């Protein structure tokens, strides 16, 4: 059973920072690209960031490009997101998801297969 479980979150003052993390299992962590998707309270879905399976390539939506870091630890089967210089506009549920880009040897997807339940971040 594939599961993505988010932690962290909470209310932070604007101008502050926090870090989210997601643990995952039921699949080889190192075989899949992952991303964070934002669910603002009334917007539903916004893409935020994408990281490849080796943790070497990261992509961001312009709105967080100078503020957020997406990272991985494949020995821990952990995905994480560091958010700096927070704005009220970043209030959302942040979902851990698997999918998006791939290895180029393995049928690139460009869609998300699995979702966690998401951490709630309020700013």
């Amino acid at each position: 059973e594939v599961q993505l479980v988010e932690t962290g979150g909470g209310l932070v003052q604007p101008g502050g920072s926090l870090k989210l993390s997601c643990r995952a299992s039921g699949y080889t962590f190192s075989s899949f690209a992952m991303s964070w998707v934002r669910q603002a309270p009334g917007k539903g879905l916004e893409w935020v960031s994408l990281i490849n399976d080796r943790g070497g390539l990261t992509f961001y939506v312009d709105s967080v490009k100078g503020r957020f870091t997406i990272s991985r630890d494949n020995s821990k089967n952990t995905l994480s997101l560091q958010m700096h210089s927070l704005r009220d506009g970043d209030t959302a549920v942040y979902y851990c998801a698997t999918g998006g880009m791939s290895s180029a040897l393995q049928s690139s997807k460009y869609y998300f297969d699995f979702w966690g339940q998401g951490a709630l971040v309020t700013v």
Binding site: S102, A104, L105, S107, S108
Partner: protein, 436 residues
């Protein structure tokens, strides 16, 4: 929507026949320095999920080893004294007429009108020869046996014939695949295959009938042949236990030296300091019987499950193909193995008499001969029989010792190795395209 990509450094190979270099360790006939002093460090990479077939009967490493050994041997003899003057009518009598043993008539006391270092002078020389070195012309007049085909070269009597092991090593771009399996019969897949740079050291031991000082089988006697159903092919039997053989020439001999030219001298058997005895080899009888029992049991696995296996003595030819032969201490022995192959297998020492020769014709090279100098003192040899070469002729099959073709003595060590060429370039589809 897939694109061709190119990968260089791809771990693939194809079978290939190339030149291997010789690597070494350690005067001596094999100390040529053509064979490069190396680090024996047996670095080995196991190929965990690779299975590849081998065929020991088509192994060019064997052909290379055969040629390298003959070439080496010939180069070592090249600068040594040519005993042209010895192919002269020789006058002989028996050394010890008053002898009633197996050696009576075997050693002859011969005289020559020999060349001295000055062109106008001759000297009278008395020397001892073995019966096998001379024939009558018809005291009686004799000639040396080489006089039919060749001059004899004095065997560089400073140089040892000890079989120092050598290693074969792949050149860059090539690799040696080692079978590493068990119960490998010489052909077909080896799921245990690993990659090495160099082979184990192999001692260039030269023999007939029995294989000496080689590798033993890991578990059980292994019987290998090119075509087991073809009686025109021989059988290599690898033992899983050594049989110790003790050989000797229990005669204290003294060696003399005569100048026969401006810088040349030859060595010869001077006299016997005691009493004449026949050379011989000792094999534990019970051990030999157990050894054959194992061989028979294994032959029955694919041939004659419920039939009769008979061992017999060789069929005939000259000594080089009918008797056991080996070099030991530098001396050349020919031993009668009939005592080892005298039994029928149906669903406490042993002694082999031995003869020696001074005039040697190795590898069936007709037109060449070597004179082995006699060796002062007494020779004691200890060795491991590690295998047999057998040939086979209702309910009974007869097996006889084989030999003569020296390549069979190298297949027994090189069957584990294959040489391949690395071909590190290939293509495969991926989803990546050039930006162009």
């Amino acid at each position: 929507n897939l694109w061709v990509t190119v990968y260089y450094g791809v771990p693939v190979w194809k079978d290939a026949e190339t030149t291997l270099f010789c690597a070494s360790d350690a005067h001596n006939v094999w100390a040529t320095h053509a064979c490069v002093p190396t680090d024996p460090n047996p670095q080995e990479i196991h190929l965990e999920n690779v299975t590849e077939e081998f065929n020991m009967w088509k192994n060019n490493m064997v052909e290379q080893m055969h040629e390298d050994i003959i070439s080496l041997w010939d180069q070592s003899l090249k600068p040594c004294v040519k005993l042209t003057p010895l192919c002269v009518t020789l006058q002989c009598t028996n050394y010890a007429p008053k002898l009633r043993s197996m050696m009576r008539g075997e050693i002859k006391n011969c005289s020559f009108n020999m060349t001295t270092e000055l062109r106008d002078k001759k000297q009278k020389v008395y020397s001892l020869f073995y019966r096998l070195d001379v024939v009558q012309i018809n005291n009686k007049e004799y000639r040396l046996i080489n006089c039919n085909t060749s001059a004899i070269t004095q065997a560089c009597p400073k140089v040892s014939f000890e079989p120092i092991p050598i290693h074969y090593c792949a050149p860059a771009g090539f690799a040696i695949l080692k079978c590493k399996d068990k119960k490998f019969n010489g052909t077909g897949p080896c799921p245990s295959v690993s990659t090495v740079q160099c082979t184990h050291g192999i001692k260039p031991v030269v023999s007939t009938q029995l294989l000496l000082n080689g590798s033993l089988a890991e578990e059980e006697v292994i019987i290998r042949s090119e075509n087991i159903t073809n009686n025109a092919k021989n059988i290599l039997v690898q033992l899983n236990t050594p049989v110790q053989i003790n050989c000797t020439r229990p005669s204290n001999n003294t060696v003399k030296s005569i100048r026969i030219g401006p810088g040349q001298a030859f060595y010869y058997f001077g006299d016997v300091l005691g009493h004449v005895r026949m050379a011989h080899c000792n094999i534990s009888k019970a051990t030999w019987n157990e050894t054959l029992g194992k061989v028979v049991k294994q032959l029955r696995k694919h041939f004659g499950n419920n039939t009769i296996i008979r061992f017999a003595q060789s069929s005939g030819g000259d000594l080089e193909v009918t008797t056991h032969s080996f070099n030991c201490g530098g001396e050349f022995f020919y031993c009668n193995t009939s005592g080892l192959f005298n039994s029928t297998w149906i669903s406490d020492s042993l002694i082999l008499p031995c003869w020696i020769k001074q005039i040697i014709n190795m590898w069936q090279r007709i037109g060449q001969a070597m004179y082995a100098p006699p060796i002062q003192g007494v020779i004691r040899c200890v060795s491991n029989i590690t295998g047999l070469i057998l040939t086979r002729d209702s309910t009974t099959e007869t097996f006889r010792p084989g030999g003569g073709d020296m390549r069979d003595n190298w297949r027994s060590e090189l069957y584990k190795y294959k040489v391949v060429k690395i071909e590190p370039l290939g293509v495969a589809p991926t989803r990546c395209k050039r930006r162009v």
